[PDB]
Symmetry: C3
């Protein structure tokens, strides 16, 4: 008759890592790292993204004629611009403070376009003749639809004095522009005044623009240039224009009607016809994992991003092919014990089999489950990367922003990886200790009533029925009832 202490083994191949050993096979693991994505741009929680397919943000906001998909645009979840989209400023020039505007856009989900200075209301000043072949609409020359290019009416340009005063209670995005022509010939040909200005004044704005007349290498067919400016107008303020030439004038403005906090993603992808709660520039994520490795930029309810390739937690114990039990004086595990992690095996005149010591198994699974939840949550708060854009003379800042974004990504990846390494090692030792404590509980019930074999087994000197066995498993073993019989069986 003999009773044995041992542990669970199965046909698992799941491997884990520790500081001291790589590729150790465990009966049970738990992967915590999402590695796949649908590779599609999807609606975010129903709400469809504004995919400015070939248009740029500038070509959307000024109303490039090739951008007639976006003249009136529904509330979007996130915006998707290409890398080098074709339909940018079609008439050459620059957009002032472009990046700080894109930044404003990251925190806006709805514009309502409204007419503020109607095209007609220019009675002097021909306002239907500012038109260029650089900006063709269906074959014939055109211009940025939300702005009007004023030129001389009957060889005269009376100094303009106009004013708009914000209502709606919303904030209003207004845009305007100045023309830098190619030479004094065109200066007088178009506005006739040899030297002109534009004065824009709100409560917080005081500018005086003046056209830089110069010959320039022509791009897109044009040697002139168009400088554009923007501003946010408070719910009850006046914008107050004045100018005697070269004035590009606002016709339409944007109401900022809902500030719902989104992003501008750079992706070459097209819309994908899906919903998801988590989007990345290269695909969407459907996952309960606490971590992913898909892409640093996300939007939605998302896993924490880390740079690992595998992130697997041990939960079970070292699976047979620090303390003294597992793969120790107990050489291997019991394929035959399925109902628990640690337990007993008995042999006697009647029976032979396995009984898992539950409630020791159960204490183990509570500790492991707590461990895992504590890992999933202790990193609840990791660095979330955001997209920030910089122009060609902000290279220092852009580099600093890069080094910063990346330093945090590296730090959190180290943290996650090393936490999982250290806790895999502690978890395997925890199983080792639970098995050793069970063996040291069985030994000390039997003392001289059985021979301690050395391999986790106790050979009984007296004979031990299934009820005597179960008394040992119970922890209620009457040593004196077998004192006598065992004593005798000693020689």
């Amino acid at each position: 008759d003999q009773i044995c202490i041992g542990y669970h083994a199965n046909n698992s191949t799941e491997q884990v890592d520790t500081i001291m050993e790589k590729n150790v096979t465990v009966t049970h693991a738990q992967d915590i790292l999402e590695k796949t994505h649908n590779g599609k741009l999807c609606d975010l929680d129903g709400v469809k993204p504004l995919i400015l397919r070939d248009c740029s943000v500038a070509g959307w906001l000024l109303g490039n004629p090739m951008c007639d998909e976006f003249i009136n645009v529904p509330e979007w979840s996130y915006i998707v611009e290409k890398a080098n989209p074709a339909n940018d400023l079609c008439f050459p020039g620059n957009f002032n403070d472009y990046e700080e505007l894109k930044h404003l856009l990251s925190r806006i989900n709805h514009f309502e376009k409204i007419q503020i200075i109607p095209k007609s209301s220019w009675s002097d000043h021909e306002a239907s003749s500012g038109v260029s072949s650089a900006c063709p609409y269906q074959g014939s020359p055109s211009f940025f639809r939300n702005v009007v290019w004023l030129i001389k009416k009957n060889n005269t340009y009376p100094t303009i004095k106009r004013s708009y005063n914000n209502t709606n209670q919303e904030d209003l995005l207004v845009l305007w522009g100045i023309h830098h022509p190619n030479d004094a010939a065109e200066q007088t040909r178009l506005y006739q005044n040899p030297t002109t200005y534009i004065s824009v004044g709100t409560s917080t704005l005081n500018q005086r623009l003046v056209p830089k007349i110069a010959t320039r290498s022509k791009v897109n067919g044009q040697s002139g240039r168009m400088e554009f400016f923007w501003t946010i107008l408070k719910p009850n303020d006046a914008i107050n224009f004045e100018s005697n030439g070269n004035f590009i004038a606002p016709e339409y403005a944007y109401k900022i009607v809902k500030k719902g906090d989104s992003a501008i993603m750079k992706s070459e992808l097209e819309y994908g016809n899906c919903n998801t709660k988590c989007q990345t520039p290269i695909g969407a994520i459907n996952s309960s994992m606490p971590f992913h490795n898909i892409h640093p930029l996300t939007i939605g309810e998302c896993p924490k991003y880390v740079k690992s390739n595998r992130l697997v937690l041990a939960t079970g114990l070292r699976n047979s092919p620090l303390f003294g039990a597992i793969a120790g004086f107990i050489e291997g595990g019991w394929q035959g014990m399925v109902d628990g992690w640690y337990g007993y095996h008995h042999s006697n005149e009647q029976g032979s089999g396995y009984a898992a010591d539950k409630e020791s198994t159960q204490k183990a699974i509570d500790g492991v489950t707590n461990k895992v939840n504590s890992i999933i949550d202790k990193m609840n708060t990791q660095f979330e990367a955001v997209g920030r854009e910089f122009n060609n003379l902000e290279r220092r800042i852009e580099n600093l922003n890069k080094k910063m974004e990346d330093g945090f990504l590296d730090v959190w990846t180290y943290n996650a990886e090393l936490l999982v390494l250290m806790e895999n090692e502690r978890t395997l030792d925890f199983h080792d200790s639970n098995v050793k404590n069970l063996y040291d509980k069985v030994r000390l019930q039997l003392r001289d009533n059985a021979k301690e074999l050395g391999n986790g087994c106790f050979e009984f000197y007296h004979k031990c029925d299934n009820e005597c066995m179960e008394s040992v498993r119970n922890g209620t073993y009457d040593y004196p009832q077998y004192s006598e019989e065992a004593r005798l069986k000693r020689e």
Copy 2:
């Protein structure tokens, strides 16, 4: 007669956390996290803060007339500005490079105001008539006291040529300004020259300002604007002004007399009449704790800021209501053992009581104390947040600065929390191991002379007096003297 191994228990309710178990009760803990603050603005190490109550920094430095608390200002420890203080630039306009000046101010504890270009010395140029109702002093119109608004004297404005050359050996903060009027009417009404300039030139400064004359939505009663500029003048340099109108001229300048490295705090609080060595925008800290959770911005000798809500270290052991002793084969602790952490209990014909195994207790308290000091100090060097201000077109930078400040705050909070979790678990196992080692020391002195009971106790076969007991506690137990008697008592 029986001797028992066991450990200390008390009536503590202090709880701690580990990775695997939450809310475990220990005989002794040590909280390391400050959670309270006096909620007052106090003198920092005696030195009283400059609380610009309703004034803004700009309204202090240019000398708004409503800011006549700060015309001559004593050395301050730290400065306290409100959020939207009423007494800013009372005559509308803007302050050039405002934030970079506030940044300079963060590293300055004393200004000495000195007159450099006295009001009188304008002999042409009426210098007592630049005055506005926008800036009222006690009912009647006034102006920024440290600067003088020059207007035409007898329908003439001779081009100004003035020069100041720094002495004192200190650095000097000089301020000036230009007026942008509302129309050409007021341009000639005040300076009479239809078109004017200001040229400011030091060794490192070469500027040409020109008034932007334009009609603007009037705020504070004024449709004109006042642009202000500043500069630091080296101890032996010349500032060298020239202008034919619209010149706001420096009368008083600041000597930077002591650069003692402080901050500008944003708080709505009023002075509190206290001293302290650590100040936050929402209250002061009196604490020996290594960490606090009061506020990220501090000044002084301060605890490290973390975002935790509780941060408690285990020092004692699991308190009764991995190795095999505590809450193991030894079911509970001894309320009756007060003089140590681990020890013995004996029963015999004479006595019954507890004796703490000191020097095992003492090795434990040295290890725990070292552990704690190493925790307190290994985080000696955490990220210290500073206040940085940005205007409405630096939103990208401000956001980057936010994400950065916060990423470090999150990383150090994770570090502290997880360090305390891991070391609480190791500390409890350390107590478990000390108890098991004591039991394995007592067993191996007695071998067959006593029956190993299973519950931390040894039932003696031979009889054992208080001196035999103390020989076992000592570690000097003569097995052969009782060989015989015990052998016999075996059956």
Copy 3:
């Protein structure tokens, strides 16, 4: 006859630290921290650094006459500028966007200087008379060699219209400048036109400069100023100048011929005549260590920089002068056991000596080696600091960049230090556990055949020859063959 379990000890003094104990002596350690440097500026992987000894980058690029070491400059590995180098802009002025250009330079290893607008080709416009004593060449007045100071030819300055169109397929760095004179006298004395401009236009550039004529405190003998500008010209674009005075004109430009990604180091050092694979501003590094503490800025294949003063890993075990063996029931180590870490000592009628239990020793050294490699590599990816420069009105950004660089340096130093502390403690406990497991393997072979002494030793009841000893070391010990003899020897 007696067999004993024990462990290795030597005459090592190497100390390590753990969370609970400082200055513990181990048989074997491994320092992982480089602490020395040759204190020299060396060729980086053969490629010699451009050491602009007394010249500044500006004085190199515009061609200060005192900078005639750098008129034609070989491909460099890294650049070395002093702190306040004497030969900067010798004629006073400023260099526009200086820092963003230095930033461009950090990613460039070769310029090829080429003439684009030859000095002769000015036929009107005296182009050999722009010369100043501020910029002396060998006693007599001179000027920036790569740029030409055009002045009036025969009391006339016909408006300049020039154009260069990039070829070579490379990117081209072009430089130019404007003169701000001291008064209208010198304005007409030099260019004769009372009011002048410069218009620079590429595809992406549209500027109109205008000389600010003002009297200024003269430095270096000059009261005038020279503002310089730069730009990168795309491989097929036109730069297109026009101006009627005050024009400093490009003669030579730079081809960006190889973009090999380097740095600009600030050091007062001179070239040192050496090669190395790792350079710091204060010296070079020759080291296999994974970490160094020399300086944060490095270039090459370099160790990770941390701020520690010592970073030593335990590999061996606690060296004699948690589990129950080392410095426990086994009081000390065996100077006499050299061939392994753990082993046996035997005494009998024939022999007396030591036998290391190899393959237990070997399992230990595999685990320790893996531990160390995992430490060396898990921090493969640490923050690499880069040098970034800022001017006197970028103090906020510079401070943010400082706090950021430093926060990462502090975080990685904490990580390394605490990892080494925790793993030193685990490594010593790992040795403790290996010794205890060996003792618990020997005990359980012998059970009653030997008396368990208490000090790691087993006193045999039966007699045990070198072959019986080796059967115990083997793990193949026949208990029944000595059952009888030992039984008898019990009394």
